[PDB]
Design a binder for this molecule. Structure first.
Ligand code: DDQ
Ligand code: DDQ
Length: 707
């Protein structure tokens, strides 16, 4: 098993996204989870976001049913500005504004999640939280796969995955992965369309050299729903005592959202001798996204719509059943270049063996944004009473009316045109010293984070250059019986793009995490079990100005302390299990407005458990039956902790059938169901006017043939 390739079992022993060197998980001083492609080929997840439902420390309902972005909250934290923090093949998919990219899970070999500070090896980053996906690479043996999907809300997907060698020595091999997917969103009127293909080529001049060209081209005409719904009609009842159906859509009938992605690069490695191996990962990408969207603001009686004329034109006891709305026309295009070069030195010192990594990381991102935002009375209002009727919870909500996205009344709306630039360069050094049953990891990195933003209207140009250092130190005790206790200290830093009263970009916020835990990776049986408790702190966060202005002030602080336990195993050639528990106690240490409050969208308790069984005997031979549940505790729906979103538990089911008994081994037919009991739940809210219905029960029929 290679950290950059398949793991023959649900549970992987090798990972390289925590130390940037192929290392067995037990030997890693930090919480690292690894979702195998096998696991994904088990729930047929719609996204990488989805594929992380059973992984501890990660919330994945920050948007409920929506899959426009794989935006995750890890250990209670996320990138500033609703930005993702996702890496692909060791290089960050730096997005900006609405320009964040997503890779389809079918093109992945494994999706990994690293909890806690990650700058010691990757540069600027939100504290406690990083996602790194590993593209599929040409396989060791021929692979000719064709897959067919069909499901709820008109889901139709056809995809292939082929990989073979051009020569008999395997010096030249390739892999072409592609898919076409179409479906209707949960919300009436909205569609999802995706076309993507991943061309990959591997060149092995010998057994010490590997150059692998990795590319991904994806076009999404319609990405789907991305609106906001009031807590009134979702979490809480509307005046008429009723609620909005989970399929309710408060967007213009003519809402449109698209994204285009193109990227080419490579993962290279060469072994010079017995102590020096060089590896370099490079990628260049140009992604675009545009949109005509009418999203919903709070209900007319929401503090938000206080200054809304349209709202202040209704009988005082009616402002609470009418929905305020706004809009945004967007069109962006960014280019992203990234290259990481590193030298791995292997040498000894007495009874101490060393694995020294030293490398430089570089990236440049440029994103040109040209959008238009509607304000308080930018768009009509929507009455919630009628769409709240039984007839709609019965026969469904109704598509609304078009909207003039062209009309840009200088009154209710305004232009937003910005040119964002970003550059980061870092040099890091780490060593993995092993003194027999003692493994000590220590390393540090220095980053040169430069940014520059041009406001094509204010004609302003805000720039800031951050020089920052972060290091991490940890130790793991290799108990020959599998258990591997460990503890470590790490740091992260995240630049601000905002500017204070002094017309200057704020200084970066930081991450300081203290963590200890134990990892059980028995060498005999194929089972992994990790457990950890930690104390993560994000210092110098932005908070409301005491003087009360339109600007924010720094110095704020938030602490996140909790416990995460996870288990993945192959308790049999017929039994498989995955489960985890998460305890997250995130709280505002220092803050003008929310001291002592817990950040929205992060539940205090989370747990999941999944198990599947396969038959090899009797008339049920080649039959797999699996099921599991995901628990999401209650959480707060706003910074003020005004109201709360209630907990919920969703059950998943699986029935797979090996198609061997028809002259087709390796091929199979399966039925996947998510939210078996079609439970109705508000996934979360980030504010009183921003709530998202969870996903309704979904059924998918899959037929994946292996030729
Ligand atoms: C596989 C581990 C399952 C553990 C589930 C624990 C549920 C804790 C619920 C917390 N509670 C709502 C009761 O406060
Ligand atoms: C997949 C694990 C299932 C855990 C379910 C835990 C439910 C706890 C309910 C406690 N309650 C909310 C009623 O106080």
């Amino acid at each position: 098993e290679s950290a950059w390739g398949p793991a023959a079992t649900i549970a992987a022993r090798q990972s390289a996204t925590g130390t940037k060197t192929d290392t067995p998980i037990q030997k890693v001083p930090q919480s690292i989870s690894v979702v195998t492609a096998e696991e994904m080929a088990l729930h047929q997840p719609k996204s990488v976001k989805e594929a992380l439902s059973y992984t501890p420390g990660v919330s994945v309902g920050t948007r409920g049913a929506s899959n426009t972005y794989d935006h995750l909250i890890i250990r209670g934290f996320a990138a500033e500005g609703q930005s993702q923090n996702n890496y692909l093949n060791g290089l960050k998919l730096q997005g900006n504004f609405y320009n964040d990219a997503v890779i389809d899970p079918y093109m992945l070999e494994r999706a990994e999640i690293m909890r806690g500070p990650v700058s010691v090896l990757y540069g600027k980053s939100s504290p406690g939280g990083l996602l790194n996906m590993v593209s599929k690479r040409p396989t060791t043996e021929p692979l000719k796969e064709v897959q067919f999907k069909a499901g709820t809300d008109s889901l139709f997907q056809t995809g292939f995955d082929f990989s073979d060698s051009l020569d008999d020595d395997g010096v030249y091999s390739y892999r072409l992965t592609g898919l076409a997917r179409s479906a209707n969103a949960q919300q009436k009127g909205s569609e999802e369309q995706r076309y993507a293909i991943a061309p990959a080529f591997t060149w092995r001049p010998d057994d010490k050299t590997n150059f692998t060209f990795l590319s991904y081209f994806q076009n999404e005409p319609e990405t789907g729903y991305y609106g906001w719904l009031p807590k009134e009609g979702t979490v809480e009842p509307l005046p008429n005592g009723k609620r909005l159906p989970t399929d309710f859509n408060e967007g213009a009938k003519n809402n449109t959202y698209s994204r285009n992605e193109k990227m080419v690069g490579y993962s290279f490695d060469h072994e010079f001798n017995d102590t020096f191996t060089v590896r370099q990962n490079l990628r260049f990408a140009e992604n675009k996204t545009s949109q005509n969207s009418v999203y919903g603001y709070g209900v007319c009686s929401d503090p938000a719509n206080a200054y809304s004329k349209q709202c202040a034109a209704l009988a005082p006891a009616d402002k609470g059943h009418y929905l305020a709305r706004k809009y945004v026309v967007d069109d962006e295009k960014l280019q992203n270049f990234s290259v990481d070069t590193q030298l791995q030195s292997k040498f000894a010192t007495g009874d101490i063996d060393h694995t020294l990594l030293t490398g430089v990381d570089f990236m440049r991102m440029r994103n040109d944004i040209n959008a238009w935002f509607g304000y308080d009375d930018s768009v009509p209002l929507l009455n919630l009473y009628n769409p709240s009727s039984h007839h709609h919870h019965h026969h469904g909500s109704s598509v609304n009316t078009d909207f003039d996205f062209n009309a840009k009344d200088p009154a209710n709306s305004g232009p937003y045109r910005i040119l964002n630039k970003q550059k980061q360069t870092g040099v890091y050094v780490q060593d993995q010293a092993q003194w027999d049953k003692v493994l000590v990891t220590l390393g540090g990195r220095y980053d040169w984070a430069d940014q520059e933003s041009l406001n094509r209207v204010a004609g302003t140009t805000d720039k800031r250059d951050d020089k920052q250092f972060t290091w991490r130190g940890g130790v793991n005790y290799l108990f020959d019986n599998g258990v591997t206790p460990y503890f470590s200290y790490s740091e992260s830093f995240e630049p601000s793009s905002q500017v204070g009263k002094d017309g200057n970009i704020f200084a970066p916020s930081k991450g300081k995490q203290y963590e200890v835990g134990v990892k059980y990776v028995p060498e005999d049986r194929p089972i992994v079990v990790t457990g950890a408790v930690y104390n993560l702190t994000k210092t110098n966060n932005l908070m409301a100005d005491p003087e009360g202005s339109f600007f924010s002030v720094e110095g704020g602080e938030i602490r996140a302390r909790g416990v995460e336990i996870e288990a993945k195993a192959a308790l049999s050639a017929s039994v498989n299990v995955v489960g985890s528990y998460t305890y997250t106690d995130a709280e505002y240490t220092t803050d003008t407005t929310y001291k002592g409050n817990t950040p929205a969208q992060v539940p205090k308790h989370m747990a999941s458990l999944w198990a599947d069984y396969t038959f090899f005997d009797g008339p049920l031979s080649g039959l797999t039956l699996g099921t599991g549940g995901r628990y999401t505790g209650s959480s707060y729906g706003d910074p003020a902790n005004s109201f709360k979103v209630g907990s919920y538990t969703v059950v998943d089911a699986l029935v797979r059938y090996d198609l061997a008994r028809v002259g087709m081994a390796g091929s199979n037919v399966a039925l996947h169901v998510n939210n078996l009991f079609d439970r109705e739940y508000v996934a979360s809210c980030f504010n009183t006017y921003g709530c998202f219905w969870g996903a309704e029960r979904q059924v998918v029929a899959t037929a994946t043939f292996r030729f």
